[PDB]
């Protein structure tokens, strides 16, 4: 076993009593009076803060020329004392930060603070800043208007938080319960995590890496994990952006064709906020028509305690829809043959998306993915609507199409045969849902879609 948590700290003198500012007292009073059904979330908040403190220290030490100490997160349960403790060897807090900041700090407020009092009769904290010459401090509070601070000896650099659990929260002093909570929400924490001296099995959050650094074998492993799949991904989009929102995401299209299970999926993409799980499922992380996509979306703009269907989620969904459409357009130009197979396999999702979309601009965006045969191209070759539009002859302002079972029947339509005399291109559409798709699309790039047979 590898444990660092023990009672090394002592206080030589008396504590100083301070009162919380009224607004922090306000939020603490809300916590004491409220009914929370998801009390386990304090653990993921504490682990996230510990990770942030370790990253702050590591980046600072590497920026200087300094050796790196042991950088770890430890949890300890004590059923006899009814406690759960977290300790990390990160940057710690100064006395000023303990006195003034607690309750009002952002994560990108008070993460780990209000949620600790949700489960605690009282909280006992030791912290010592990593800055040279820093002294250790003890901070104590029962979550009422008062907290205490005192200089403490025997404090290790970093922070230790001891939660003396409430009567109805003793489940968090059981190792097995805590282990399951960690695995559920905190499995991708990026520093070593130990529970009661045992290293926890955690996973690598490859979505946080620079896209150019992730190799195909790593994507294949991660795809198989997140999709619970045995094939390989036919497409991979690793999308990282800082504007208008923070996004670190990986999207995969399966090699296999869609089955009845992918069409009826309840859970397509997992949602994280800086490596803290928010939902294994995805309400509408992506549009419904993109439910065939597997993978992960991480946005630190997502706050840690939620319930969704917010403006933030809607904005994220719209950004991701545009980026995925752009990706598929880019893939069609990189490898048209592979894209044609993707459209054959997954194109009913695009047609669905056009039919169900509310906004004309979204319909036309999705329609950029459609590929059809054309009277003007060799049998079997596909064209896009924009390529058709680029070939339109002066004086002809509509996009003409014909739905038929196959190319032979299309070419022998008496309507098409007559039109051929005047050079007008006609799209040939062989999928049974093409009629509805193009009826709903109605127009593309301000050009009306006209079926050459009524
Ligand atoms: O959740 C925490 C917490 C946990 C682990 C930590 O390591 C720190 C810390 O020392 N940090 C975190 C940082 C993140 C970014 C930069 C520096 C940082 C220093 C803070 N609470 C501490 C409490 C103290 C009192 C009450 C509730 C509390 C909850
Ligand atoms: O009155 C018609 C009608 C009559 C003759 C037609 O030839 C067409 C047609 O399909 N065209 C005409 C074209 C002229 C130029 C180019 C292409 C063209 C395709 C349509 N209805 C069809 C109905 C179908 C259902 C219900 C009422 C309907 C009435």
From Swiss-Prot:
GO terms for molecular function: ATP binding; ATP hydrolysis activity; ATP-dependent protein folding chaperone; protein kinase binding; RNA binding; tumor necrosis factor receptor binding; unfolded protein binding. The modification Phosphoserine is found at residue 100. It comes from the Eukaryota. GO terms for cellular component: membrane; mitochondrial inner membrane; mitochondrial intermembrane space; mitochondrial matrix; mitochondrion; nucleoplasm. ATP binds at residues 49, 88, 101, 113. Keywords: Acetylation, ATP-binding, Chaperone, Membrane, Mitochondrion, Mitochondrion inner membrane, Nucleotide-binding, Phosphoprotein, Transit peptide. The modification Phosphothreonine is found at residues 104, 396. It is found in: Mitochondrion; Mitochondrion inner membrane; Mitochondrion matrix. GO terms for biological process: chaperone-mediated protein folding; negative regulation of cellular respiration; negative regulation of intrinsic apoptotic signaling pathway in response to hydrogen peroxide; negative regulation of reactive oxygen species biosynthetic process; protein folding; translational attenuation. Its main location: mitochondrion. Coiled coil: none annotated. Found in skeletal muscle, liver, heart, brain, kidney, pancreas, lung, placenta and bladder. Expression is highly reduced in bladder cancer and renal cell carcinoma specimens compared to healthy tissues, but it is increased in other type of tumors. The modification N6-acetyllysine is found at residues 170, 232, 240, 326, 333, 368. Binds to the intracellular domain of tumor necrosis factor type 1 receptor. Binds to RB1. Interacts with SRC. Interacts with SDHA. Chaperone that expresses an ATPase activity. Involved in maintaining mitochondrial function and polarization, downstream of PINK1 and mitochondrial complex I. Is a negative regulator of mitochondrial respiration able to modulate the balance between oxidative phosphorylation and aerobic glycolysis. The impact of TRAP1 on mitochondrial respiration is probably mediated by modulation of mitochondrial SRC and inhibition of SDHA. Belongs to the heat shock protein 90 family. This is Heat shock protein 75 kDa, mitochondrial. It comes from Homo sapiens.
